[PDB]
Amino acid sequence: IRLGCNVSAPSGVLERVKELMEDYSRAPDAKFQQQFRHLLSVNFEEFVAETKERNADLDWVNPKLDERLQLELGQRQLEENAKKRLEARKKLPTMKYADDIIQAVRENQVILIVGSTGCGKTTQVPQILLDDAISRGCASSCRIICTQPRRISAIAIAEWVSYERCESLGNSVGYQIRLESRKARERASITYCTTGVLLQQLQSDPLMHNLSVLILDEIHERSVETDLLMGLLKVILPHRPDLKVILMSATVREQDFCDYFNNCPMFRIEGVMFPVKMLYLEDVLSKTNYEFQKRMKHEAMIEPYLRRIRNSYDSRVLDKLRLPESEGCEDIDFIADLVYYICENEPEGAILVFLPGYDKISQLYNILDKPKTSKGQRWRDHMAVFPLHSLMQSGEQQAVFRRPPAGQRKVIISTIIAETSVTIDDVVYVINSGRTKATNYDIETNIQSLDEVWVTKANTQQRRGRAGRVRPGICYNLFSRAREDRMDDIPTPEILRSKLESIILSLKLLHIDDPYRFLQTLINAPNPEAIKMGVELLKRIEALDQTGTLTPLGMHLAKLPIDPQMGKMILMSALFCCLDPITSAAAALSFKSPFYSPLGKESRVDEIKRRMARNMRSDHLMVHNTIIAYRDSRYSHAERDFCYKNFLSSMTLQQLERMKNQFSELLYNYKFLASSNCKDAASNKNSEKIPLLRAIIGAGLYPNMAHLRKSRRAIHTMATDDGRRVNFHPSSVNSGESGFDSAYFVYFQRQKSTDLFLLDSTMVFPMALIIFGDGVEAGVTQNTPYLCVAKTYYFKCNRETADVVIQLRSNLEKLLLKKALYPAPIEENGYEKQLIKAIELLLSLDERL
DNA sequence: GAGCACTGC
Known part of the structure; x- marks a missing residue:
């Protein structure tokens, strides 16, 4: 056991906390x-x-x-x-x-x-x-x-x-x-x-x-x-x-x-539909004669196939199929050369290029926009090139849908977003790389990863139809028919990919109380181990009791249109009078960040996020500062200028505002708030108290915790509470920063790509984790008195502070159970407020001085 | 130093 920083509170504060708890205890x-x-x-x-x-x-x-x-x-x-x-x-x-x-x-x-x-x-x-x-x-x-x-x-x-x-x-x-x-x-x-x-x-x-x-x-x-x-x-x-x-x-x-x-x-x-001819890699290379250069496995796949087609293609074409980088998107100049090939031959029509993700879209865009080859420099001014990605603005403008200026051919470089979600009508030509990205969860290591994978046969059939809307099209598949033979029919059904807490909880309101029995009847039954993981999480946040029965808190959370952890956080922000910042954080996690990431602007975007984070070391408070600034820009009639300078989607911001308002109205209807306006002054008295906002954010993202040990952009030595080393995701507002006031963090999502990354984080203080968390005990390890949280992080704490904090947690649990069973706003001068004040006082000790 | 895609009386 390694002992962390001292959390003891001063006697004068302890004295006042105990007065406040005993005022709370005199309620009828x-x-x-x-x-x-x-x-x-x-x-x-x-x-x-x-x-x-x-x-x-x-x-x-x-x-x-x-x-x-x-x-x-x-x-x-x-x-x-x-x-x-x-x-x-x-x-x-x-x-x-x-x-x-x-x-x-x-x-x-x-x-x-x-x-x-x-x-x-x-x-x-x-x-x-x-x-x-x-x-x-x-x-x-x-x-x-x-x-x-x-x-x-x-x-x-x-x-x-x-x-x-x-x-x-x-x-x-x-x-x-x-x-x-x-x-x-x-x-x-x-x-x-x-x-x-x-x-x-x-x-x-x-x-x-x-x-x-x-x-x-x-x-x-x-x-x-x-x-x-x-x-x-x-x-x-x-x-x-x-x-x-x-x-x-x-x-x-x-x-x-x-x-x-x-x-x-x-x-x-x-x-x-108009017919769309399907070409595979053998047919593409037989047309372009492109020459490559700068496990196998792959050899067991390609050589039998090269035998079967040996008489239908030239041997030098077939021999290129033995290169593993001939298939997929591994060689971007090969793809650029196919784009140039279609520009030179074939009738007028738009080209739609399916690539797995942001990085490969960026590579192809730069090749076409700033070509090193003479063939490319001839074509650069004759193409209108649109990258298409859920994080880029292109889909939220009109240009990618309209026909290009005369003498220019439209070329769209897209993720799977253009398979169904986004539709461009003048596409005659699809280049299907066959590669996408997928999120995979490993039950045994509790690790979610984002991996480049082959698409399925259904994906290829969907991309082929995208060329047949106006006239007869062509679909160029950058893999062999032997690769196709190995592809799955369909993507993994997403319910086998899903976290189950929200579903299991919602079933309770439909009187389906046994989730193992019901989910086993689905077309594809989720892993029973994931159901158990869902039930245990819901017991941990006390949406279910130890028998698995719905609690009053659980019923409230099932009646909010958001994951239960974030629903809990929203409910706590009503009790602690921080409604507006907390609904901003919840809505962004439930939906998405308002920030774009346009090509080549990524360091500029990083600097904007820094300025919006206002040195608060939280991606979640950063989003709320963005919303505050967005409202100011509407009030100033500067909205467009503001969104342009800061790389923000006004459409996302307006949807986040609508979701904050839906949360506020539902809490009002459930009698947790006196007003349905999420900006209402009564619901926001604490909304500028940052240590209180970190506490409520922590109460919602708990138990996802991380601890930073490190010095130096800075290099970080950081581990989640399970001991695995992590870093902040480069898109996160804590990546590379130094001088954190606290070494502890909570996070919504951790994900493995090139490293195990925290995609979002808020810096938190130990005393907040202790008050709102679990696995809390006081004791003595060496000869030092301690207070711990999650039986994981042990803090030096004296007896006086430990006994008061443990007593505070008991009264807080009593208050939370009563508010859930008997919803009502916390009256400003009443008994319950004195317990809220006790907690505010303890958390204010960590204010930035 | 990096971000497949959907969605909620």
């Missing part, structure tokens, strides 16, 4: 406690009966509305606005199958519709079912929900379908995503939403009584949400005979979902 309506007791006392059969009675609205129909919309449909089908657009819709393959889909839905609870791009299933199926219900005089019984994986798709599809019906958004078609909606009319309507919106609405309507038809789209992508939804339908559907479900998939292991729901009926609907 709750509808939340009755709801929590009721949830725990009902079995699943009762839960089902009670939710039926509470969501009965769809038991009510409106015969005059039914008659009126039937009449209006028949009439307006003779108007000349529709009946053009109806003849155009009938060109969509899905409309050929309308009557068979109507009949199959009528005869089956679940059907599956399988189709590729252009088939029209997403826009036409909801309309077919809606117009049939209206035609049959059933209109007001029809409420159709169609889930989408992505926000932008929910909006765009809803707007398109609304236009096809000659309606403004909000009549028969609507959309709902998080914090934005254009709601359709209540009945005889189609709503497009993100899958997560529907999952959240299950808390109020767990058996889905409030819709007649559920359409799950893009299930072949195997997001957590749709995988979970399908598992929940196995619980729900036996209790909902009248509910209809239409599953929708691209043709990517479509049979999995058919098998998963008994053997349900499956429609295969043909696509509409």
Whole structure:
């Protein structure tokens, strides 16, 4: 055991802390406690009966509305606005199958519709079912929900379908995503939403009584949400005979979902796309004749294949396939040369280059922008080159979508973001490197890593279609067919990649209390060891008790749309009156940083982050300072100038503001706050006390702790609490800095790439970790009295301070349990405030002097 | 000294 710095507090402070604790100890309506007791006392059969009675609205129909919309449909089908657009819709393959889909839905609870791009299933199926219900005089019984994986798709599809019906958004078609909606009319309507919106609405309507038809789209992508939804339908559907479900998939292991729901009926609907010829590395080199130079394994892969194709290609072409760097993106000049090849030959059209990540995008951009080869210098001024990455601004401007100036060919250098998330319509040419990056978690070492990997066959098939939107395209794959043969069908289903705390907790509000039993019923069952890791984390933050039963705190956290650790932090910031900085930190961790990282500007970005961090040694407080400065720029009508100078996305900043406001409104509704405004002065009295903000941030990121031992940019010797050496990620505001006031840090995420990095950190003080943490005990190790935290970090502490801190923790636990069971704002002059004051006083001792 | 991509009444 190694003893750390002395945490003893002065007698004058100890005296006041004990006065404040004893004032707190002299303390003597709750509808939340009755709801929590009721949830725990009902079995699943009762839960089902009670939710039926509470969501009965769809038991009510409106015969005059039914008659009126039937009449209006028949009439307006003779108007000349529709009946053009109806003849155009009938060109969509899905409309050929309308009557068979109507009949199959009528005869089956679940059907599956399988189709590729252009088939029209997403826009036409909801309309077919809606117009049939209206035609049959059933209109007001029809409420159709169609889930989408992505926000932008929910909006765009809803707007398109609304236009096809000659309606403004909000009549028969609507959309709902998080914090934005254009709601359709209540009945005889189609709503497009993100899958997560529907999952959240299950808390109020767990058996889905409030819709007649559920359409799950893009299930072949195997997001957590749709995988979970399908598992929940196995619980729900036996209790909902009248509910209809239409599953929708691209043709990517479509049979999995058919098998998963008994053997349900499956429609295969043909696509509409222009042909895209597929070339592989052998064909590419046979065209360009590019010459390379500056385990194997690989040799066992390529040599049998070179035998099979020996007569179809020149031997010098085949011989290049034996070079391991011929495949993938390992040689960027090879890729640049293929770009030049397409620029010289082939018809006009844009080039879309799929590369794994930021680093290789930067390399290809620099080669094309500042070429060393004469062939490149000829082409430099004839290309319009756009790097595309989730951290770069290019996707948030218009230029990459519009056609380039005449005589210039657009070249887009992209990550997987342009596979689905981002769409460029004038692309005729795709260079598919076959490489992406993936995050991998190793259960046994508890290490998350980011590794360059081969893409899957489904990825290659998706990238190929990206060349066929306008005219016949070409897809150049930078690997051999032998490499393709070795690729997996699909990416690992993301639920096998996921941390499970939030899911397990949310299931409790649906009365699925045994997560081992339910998650085993998914299409791919997560590792039971990851479920246990999820349950143990939830017991550690006391969202579950030691029996695994939901606590009052756990119920509150399940009702916030954020990971429970950060939900806890937000709730603590309400009690400790730091709401605004803490919701900023939580929202940035839950969503993302507002900072861009544009090509070549990375040291400039580092300097901006430094200035926003204001020497507070926290990436989390840095984000909040950014938000404070962003508000000032709006108040100054300097918003654009501010975002430009500081490399900030105003779109991300505005979304972070919306999320902070959602957290504030929910806490207000749950009676933890007197005001719903996250800036409200009452909720923020402590928001400029930095040691208090470090304490609350620590309370949320605990137990992820690190300890720095080191001197010198500076070199760092630092280890997380598990003993593994780490460094701050270079993008972090603590990388390379020296002179930390404290050697301790908390962090949200640790990740291995070239080193084991902390991607974000806040410098913290021991006494804060001790007050809000666990594994706390006082004792004597050598002859020195100590106080420890997590049974890991042992601090010199005298008896007087130890006994007061241990007593403080007991009262804090008592206060937290009571606020969770009986939510109410902490009154300024009351008993509970005196315990808050005791803690503020102890934490203020670490203020920067 | 480095950052695949989604998302929440």
